[PDB]
Amino acid sequence: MASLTEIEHLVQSVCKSYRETCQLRLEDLLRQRSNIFSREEVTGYQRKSMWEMWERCAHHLTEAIQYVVEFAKRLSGFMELCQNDQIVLLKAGAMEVVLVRMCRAYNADNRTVFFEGKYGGMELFRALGCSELISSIFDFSHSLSALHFSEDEIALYTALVLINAHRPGLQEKRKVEQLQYNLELAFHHHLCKTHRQSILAKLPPKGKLRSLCSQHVERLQIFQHLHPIVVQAAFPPLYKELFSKILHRLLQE
Numbered sequence: 001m002a003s004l005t006e007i008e009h010l011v012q013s014v015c016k017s018y019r020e021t022c023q024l025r026l027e028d029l030l031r032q033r034s035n036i037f038s039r040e041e042v043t044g045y046q047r048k049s050m051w052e053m054w055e056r057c058a059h060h061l062t063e064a065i066q067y068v069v070e071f072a073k074r075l076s077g078f079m080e081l082c083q084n085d086q087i088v089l090l091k092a093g094a095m096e097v098v099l100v101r102m103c104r105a106y107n108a109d110n111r112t113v114f115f116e117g118k119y120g121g122m123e124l125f126r127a128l129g130c131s132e133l134i135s136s137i138f139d140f141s142h143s144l145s146a147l148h149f150s151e152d153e154i155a156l157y158t159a160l161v162l163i164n165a166h167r168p169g170l171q172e173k174r175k176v177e178q179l180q181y182n183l184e185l186a187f188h189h190h191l192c193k194t195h196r197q198s199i200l201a202k203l204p205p206k207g208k209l210r211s212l213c214s215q216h217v218e219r220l221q222i223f224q225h226l227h228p229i230v231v232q233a234a235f236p237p238l239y240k241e242l243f244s245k246i247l248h249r250l251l252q253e
């Protein structure tokens, strides 16, 4: 099954689907690299209350997950799967996809990330009381930056992050296995064609993305225990559903 011309067609539709569902244009993120938060602005973020910062971050994460849901809906084969499998894949992989896409908003030259209009370092997020998780996320973005990914490479890699046939809870394992295999062929074909197969050994282990998501859920549980009414009243419904239905509505649309 699937010939060379069909593999190349898959590469291009995956790249198109990714281009259409990016929250931020890479050119826009690059043109803003000089717009950095001043010492006073950083101090203002640090002085914000823990709950205020958590709410802002969960709001920005919910917006980014919404673009990832749209990427999945445009991904060839995803809407053909059953609703249980579409939801199992989004619950386990949407945050992993946001974690990979985030490297585009990262600047390795000064170790800053784009956040609310400007670039700021790790210290911008000190009010979260997450410094170990923040460090891991900045290290993961730093390690993806060292690979110099093209946009097409991130498109093929993130499709594979999402279409993972090993996720527990899949009712039609074989249909997801088939789609994962076609996407693997498309990614390796594109790497072979562009002389970029050397990145294969340098891609992060799958346990690394799993560990970052687990840490996110653990720090959220700590925060929700101390501020349960804040989570209930001011956190986005889609965020609580994924990390603490909305997904069923987004997938029907």
Ligand SMILES: N#Cc1cc2c(cc1C(F)(C(F)(F)F)C(F)(F)F)CC[C@H]1N(C(=O)[C@H]3CC[C@H](C(=O)O)CC3)CC[C@@]21S(=O)(=O)c1ccc(F)cc1
Binding pocket: 021, 022, 023, 024, 025, 054, 056, 057, 058, 059, 060, 061, 064, 067, 098, 099, 101, 102, 104, 105, 113, 114, 115, 116, 125, 128, 130, 133, 134, 137, 138, 215, 216, 219
């Ligand atoms: N709620 C949140 C939350 C939200 C986000 C991240 C982490 C968390 C946590 F939770 C954590 F770490 F636990 F996961 C944190 F840190 F707050 F605790 C990392 C990805 C980031 N992000 C992006 O950089 C986007 C991704 C999509 C991309 C595109 O589609 O083009 C544009 C850039 C989405 C939200 C955002 S953020 O900007 O609020 C931000 C927050 C902390 C940080 F260390 C760096 C950035």
